[PDB]
Amino acid sequence: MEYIKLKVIGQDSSEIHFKVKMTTHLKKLKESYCQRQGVPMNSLRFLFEGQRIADNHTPKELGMEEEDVIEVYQEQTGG
């Protein structure tokens, strides 16, 4: 868009902000977020408008925009 700022928010109200291309698979964003939390990739789920974000979803596909929010949750919860 070419890059949009996406916000990832957890239960604690903490935010981490990513600049991503609309074109790029959201796996990289997920991967980085997990890294910043020090937890495996398979332990967190990311939702946009209440729907799970797949590894091969792109911001273009899901219709995302500047400053949109992704909510992150523990799988299960587990993990």
Partner: protein
């Protein structure tokens, strides 16, 4: 490094599930709540039934971006009296060398356990600390005395 961080996340998850009693291993949390898995603050309990018993010895564990193909560096803070710990606190141990006995399959649990065992049974093939070493070999009595005073110094109180 994705490879290093993905493995250290597995390590941390497994530690949280189950680790040996008395051992501590906590990755460094940044002021902002985010994690630095390349630097872990640890503690080793002195082995039971030995002059080390009762001591809880802090060791820092530092990982490089080529972890797990590379070993961590393991540093006692403060340095300990022991033949195989350099005056720096850095542990001399073969599983902490790619060219000796480090392999990717070695976990943080096995590292900490490896070092706890080393504390108790020194390798006389590696004098890292010449005065601890000389006393170990030539005056076991004074050695044991210093070991017990040091365990006592680092006993939770």
């Amino acid at each position: 490094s994705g490879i290093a961080l993905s493995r250290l996340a597995q390590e941390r998850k497994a530690w949280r599930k189950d680790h040996p009693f008395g051992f501590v291993a906590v990755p460094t949390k940044n002021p902002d709540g985010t994690m630095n898995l390349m630097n872990w603050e640890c503690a080793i309990p002195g082995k039971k039934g030995t002059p080390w018993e009762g001591g809880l010895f802090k060791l820092r564990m530092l990982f490089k971006d080529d972890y797990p193909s590379s070993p961590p560096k393991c540093k006692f803070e403060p340095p300990l009296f022991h033949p195989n710990v350099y005056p720096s606190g850095t542990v001399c141990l073969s599983i902490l060398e790619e060219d000796k006995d480090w392999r990717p399959a070695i976990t943080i649990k096995q590292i900490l356990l490896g070092i706890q065992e080393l504390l108790n049974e020194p390798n006389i093939q590696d004098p890292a600390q010449a005065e601890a070493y000389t006393i170990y070999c030539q005056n076991r009595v004074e050695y044991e005395k210093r070991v017990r005073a040091q365990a006592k110094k680092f006993a939770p109180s």
